[PDB]
Amino acid sequence: ISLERLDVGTNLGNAIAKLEDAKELLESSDQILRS
Amino acid sequence: ISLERLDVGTNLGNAIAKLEDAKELLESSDQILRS
Amino acid sequence: ISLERLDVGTNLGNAIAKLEDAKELLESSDQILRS
Amino acid sequence: NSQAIDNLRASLETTNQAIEAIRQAGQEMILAVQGVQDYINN
Amino acid sequence: NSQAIDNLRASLETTNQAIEAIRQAGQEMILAVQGVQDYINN
Amino acid sequence: NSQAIDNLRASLETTNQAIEAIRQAGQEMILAVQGVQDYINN
Ligand SMILES: [Mg+2]
Ligand SMILES: [Mg+2]
Ligand SMILES: [Mg+2]
Ligand SMILES: [Mg+2]
Ligand SMILES: [Mg+2]
Ligand SMILES: [Mg+2]
């Protein structure tokens, strides 16, 4: 029997965290442009 | 028996649609710069 | 018996090569800005 | 001149919009990989 | 000055080129996920 | 004016930083797909 499951959630979570860091930087870029 | 197949084509199709929307925006950015 | 293994390494390698080409272009963009 | 400044700003706003579309593509690719993992585990 | 405008334009064109390379990486990642799905189904 | 040039440069540097974060997300997505392939093969 195998009690292991597939779990790539840490890399996918890291990817989401970085896409979210990118989102905040794009909003800050727009704030500078609007100013 | 299982009649289910793996199908992540809708998320991959959505990803392609967005990469293609991005392509058109990058071409429009270049058009403004060339002008 | 099946002697085939899953191998998407060529597409993943191509993706890495392009992320790396992008990195070098972002560094060149920064070099022009610093100047 | 004011056209050159307006065009640089408009190009950079358009570029920022393009990057957001790529960011959204990344989110959909992540959902696809999550769907592969769920299918294997289920 | 004209050097500052030329440098902003050149940097933004280089940045746009970098984004296109990331877009192409995304297309290759999608092909890889499609290849995982085909392997599982086949 | 000098504020307009400073703001365009600061916005473009911030945009370049955002693109690097998306590039890093891509690297993590690639590691996730490699982990799916390893799990299937192993
Ligand atoms: Mg964060
Ligand atoms: Mg805001
Ligand atoms: Mg579209
Ligand atoms: Mg054109
Ligand atoms: Mg290369
Ligand atoms: Mg350098």
Coordinates of C-alpha atoms and ligand atoms in Angstrom, one line a residue:
Chain A
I1 CA 0.0 0.0 0.0
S2 CA 1.1 3.6 -0.6
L3 CA 0.1 6.3 1.9
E4 CA 1.8 9.0 -0.3
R5 CA -0.5 11.5 -2.2
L6 CA 0.6 13.9 -4.9
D7 CA 1.3 17.3 -3.3
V8 CA 2.8 20.2 -5.3
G9 CA 0.9 22.7 -3.2
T10 CA 4.0 24.4 -1.9
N11 CA 5.3 25.3 -5.3
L12 CA 1.9 26.3 -6.5
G13 CA 1.4 28.3 -3.3
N14 CA 4.8 30.0 -3.9
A15 CA 3.7 30.8 -7.5
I16 CA 0.5 32.4 -6.2
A17 CA 2.4 34.4 -3.6
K18 CA 4.6 35.8 -6.4
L19 CA 1.8 36.5 -8.7
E20 CA 0.2 38.4 -5.8
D21 CA 3.5 40.3 -5.0
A22 CA 3.5 41.2 -8.8
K23 CA -0.1 42.5 -8.6
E24 CA 0.7 44.8 -5.7
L25 CA 3.8 46.2 -7.7
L26 CA 1.6 46.8 -10.8
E27 CA -0.9 48.7 -8.7
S28 CA 2.0 50.8 -7.2
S29 CA 3.3 51.4 -10.8
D30 CA -0.1 52.7 -11.8
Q31 CA -0.3 54.9 -8.7
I32 CA 3.0 56.6 -9.7
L33 CA 1.7 57.1 -13.3
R34 CA -1.7 58.6 -12.2
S35 CA 0.3 61.0 -10.0
Chain B
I1 CA -15.2 1.1 -14.6
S2 CA -14.5 4.9 -14.8
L3 CA -15.8 6.8 -17.9
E4 CA -14.1 10.1 -16.6
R5 CA -11.0 11.4 -18.3
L6 CA -8.7 14.2 -17.2
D7 CA -9.8 17.4 -18.7
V8 CA -8.1 20.7 -17.6
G9 CA -8.7 22.2 -21.0
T10 CA -11.0 24.9 -19.9
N11 CA -8.3 26.4 -17.5
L12 CA -5.6 25.9 -20.1
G13 CA -7.8 27.5 -22.8
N14 CA -8.5 30.4 -20.4
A15 CA -4.7 30.8 -19.9
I16 CA -4.1 30.8 -23.7
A17 CA -6.9 33.4 -24.2
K18 CA -5.2 35.7 -21.6
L19 CA -1.7 35.2 -23.1
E20 CA -3.3 36.2 -26.4
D21 CA -5.1 39.3 -24.9
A22 CA -1.6 40.2 -23.5
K23 CA 0.0 39.8 -26.9
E24 CA -2.5 42.2 -28.4
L25 CA -1.8 44.8 -25.6
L26 CA 2.0 44.5 -26.1
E27 CA 1.5 45.2 -29.8
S28 CA -0.6 48.2 -29.0
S29 CA 2.0 49.4 -26.5
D30 CA 4.7 49.2 -29.3
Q31 CA 2.4 51.0 -31.8
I32 CA 2.1 54.0 -29.3
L33 CA 6.0 54.0 -28.8
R34 CA 6.8 53.8 -32.6
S35 CA 4.4 56.8 -33.0
Chain C
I1 CA 4.5 -3.9 -20.3
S2 CA 5.1 -0.2 -21.1
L3 CA 8.7 1.1 -21.4
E4 CA 7.4 4.7 -21.9
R5 CA 7.8 7.3 -19.1
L6 CA 6.3 10.7 -18.9
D7 CA 8.7 13.3 -20.3
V8 CA 7.5 16.9 -20.7
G9 CA 11.1 18.1 -20.1
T10 CA 11.5 19.6 -23.5
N11 CA 8.6 22.0 -23.1
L12 CA 9.6 22.8 -19.5
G13 CA 13.2 23.3 -20.7
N14 CA 12.0 25.7 -23.4
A15 CA 9.9 27.6 -20.8
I16 CA 13.0 27.9 -18.6
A17 CA 15.1 29.1 -21.5
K18 CA 12.5 31.8 -22.2
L19 CA 12.2 32.9 -18.6
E20 CA 16.0 33.2 -18.7
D21 CA 16.0 35.2 -21.9
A22 CA 13.4 37.5 -20.2
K23 CA 15.6 37.9 -17.1
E24 CA 18.5 39.1 -19.3
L25 CA 16.2 41.6 -21.1
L26 CA 14.9 42.9 -17.7
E27 CA 18.5 43.5 -16.6
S28 CA 19.3 45.3 -19.9
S29 CA 16.1 47.5 -19.4
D30 CA 17.4 48.4 -15.9
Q31 CA 20.9 49.2 -17.2
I32 CA 19.3 51.7 -19.8
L33 CA 17.2 53.3 -16.9
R34 CA 20.2 53.6 -14.5
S35 CA 22.1 55.3 -17.3
Chain D
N1 CA 7.3 67.5 -25.8
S2 CA 3.8 66.9 -24.4
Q3 CA 3.0 64.3 -27.1
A4 CA 6.2 62.4 -26.2
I5 CA 5.3 62.4 -22.5
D6 CA 1.7 61.4 -23.2
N7 CA 2.9 58.5 -25.5
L8 CA 5.4 57.2 -23.0
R9 CA 2.7 57.2 -20.3
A10 CA 0.1 55.6 -22.5
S11 CA 2.5 52.9 -23.6
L12 CA 3.6 52.1 -20.1
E13 CA -0.1 52.0 -18.9
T14 CA -0.8 49.6 -21.9
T15 CA 2.3 47.5 -20.9
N16 CA 1.1 47.3 -17.3
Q17 CA -2.3 46.1 -18.6
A18 CA -0.6 43.4 -20.7
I19 CA 1.4 42.2 -17.7
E20 CA -1.9 41.9 -15.7
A21 CA -3.3 39.7 -18.5
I22 CA -0.2 37.4 -18.2
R23 CA -0.6 37.4 -14.4
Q24 CA -4.2 36.1 -15.0
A25 CA -3.0 33.5 -17.4
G26 CA -0.6 32.3 -14.6
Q27 CA -3.5 31.9 -12.2
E28 CA -5.4 29.8 -14.8
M29 CA -2.3 27.6 -15.3
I30 CA -2.1 27.1 -11.6
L31 CA -5.8 26.0 -11.5
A32 CA -5.0 23.5 -14.3
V33 CA -2.1 22.0 -12.4
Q34 CA -4.3 21.8 -9.3
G35 CA -6.9 19.9 -11.4
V36 CA -4.2 17.4 -12.6
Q37 CA -3.2 16.8 -8.9
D38 CA -6.9 16.4 -7.8
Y39 CA -7.5 13.9 -10.7
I40 CA -4.4 11.8 -9.8
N41 CA -5.3 11.8 -6.0
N42 CA -9.1 11.1 -6.6
Chain E
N1 CA 16.4 66.0 -22.5
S2 CA 16.6 64.0 -25.6
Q3 CA 18.9 61.4 -23.9
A4 CA 16.4 60.9 -21.1
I5 CA 13.4 60.5 -23.6
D6 CA 15.5 58.1 -25.8
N7 CA 16.5 56.1 -22.7
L8 CA 12.9 55.8 -21.4
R9 CA 11.7 54.7 -24.8
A10 CA 14.5 52.2 -25.2
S11 CA 14.0 50.8 -21.7
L12 CA 10.2 50.4 -22.3
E13 CA 10.8 48.7 -25.6
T14 CA 13.3 46.3 -23.9
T15 CA 10.8 45.7 -21.1
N16 CA 8.0 44.9 -23.7
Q17 CA 10.4 42.4 -25.3
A18 CA 11.1 40.8 -21.9
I19 CA 7.3 40.4 -21.3
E20 CA 6.9 38.7 -24.7
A21 CA 9.6 36.2 -23.7
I22 CA 7.6 35.5 -20.5
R23 CA 4.5 35.1 -22.6
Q24 CA 6.3 32.5 -24.7
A25 CA 7.4 30.7 -21.6
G26 CA 3.7 30.5 -20.6
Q27 CA 2.8 28.9 -23.9
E28 CA 5.5 26.2 -23.3
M29 CA 4.3 25.6 -19.8
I30 CA 0.8 25.1 -21.2
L31 CA 2.1 22.6 -23.7
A32 CA 3.8 20.7 -20.8
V33 CA 0.6 20.5 -18.8
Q34 CA -1.2 19.3 -22.0
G35 CA 1.4 16.6 -22.3
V36 CA 0.8 15.5 -18.7
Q37 CA -2.9 15.2 -19.4
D38 CA -2.4 13.3 -22.7
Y39 CA 0.0 10.9 -20.9
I40 CA -2.5 10.2 -18.1
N41 CA -5.5 9.8 -20.5
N42 CA -3.4 7.6 -23.0
Chain F
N1 CA 9.2 68.5 -16.2
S2 CA 11.6 66.8 -13.7
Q3 CA 8.6 65.3 -11.7
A4 CA 7.2 63.8 -14.9
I5 CA 10.5 62.2 -15.9
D6 CA 11.1 61.0 -12.3
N7 CA 7.6 59.5 -12.2
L8 CA 8.0 57.7 -15.6
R9 CA 11.3 56.2 -14.5
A10 CA 10.0 55.2 -11.1
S11 CA 6.9 53.6 -12.7
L12 CA 9.0 51.7 -15.2
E13 CA 11.4 50.4 -12.5
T14 CA 8.4 49.3 -10.5
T15 CA 6.9 47.6 -13.6
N16 CA 10.2 45.8 -14.2
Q17 CA 10.1 44.6 -10.6
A18 CA 6.6 43.3 -11.1
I19 CA 7.6 41.4 -14.2
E20 CA 10.5 39.8 -12.2
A21 CA 7.9 38.5 -9.7
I22 CA 5.9 37.0 -12.5
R23 CA 9.0 35.4 -13.8
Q24 CA 9.7 33.9 -10.4
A25 CA 6.1 32.6 -10.3
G26 CA 6.8 30.9 -13.6
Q27 CA 9.8 29.1 -12.2
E28 CA 7.7 27.8 -9.3
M29 CA 4.9 26.6 -11.7
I30 CA 7.6 24.7 -13.6
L31 CA 8.8 23.0 -10.4
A32 CA 5.2 22.0 -9.7
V33 CA 4.8 20.4 -13.1
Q34 CA 8.2 18.6 -12.6
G35 CA 6.8 17.3 -9.3
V36 CA 3.7 16.0 -11.0
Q37 CA 5.9 14.2 -13.6
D38 CA 8.2 12.7 -10.9
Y39 CA 5.1 11.5 -8.9
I40 CA 3.7 9.8 -12.0
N41 CA 7.0 8.2 -13.0
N42 CA 7.9 7.1 -9.4
Ligands
MG1 MG 3.6 38.6 -0.7
MG2 MG -4.1 52.3 -6.5
MG3 MG -9.2 37.6 -26.2
MG4 MG 1.6 46.9 -34.8
MG5 MG 18.6 32.0 -24.0
MG6 MG 23.2 45.2 -14.8

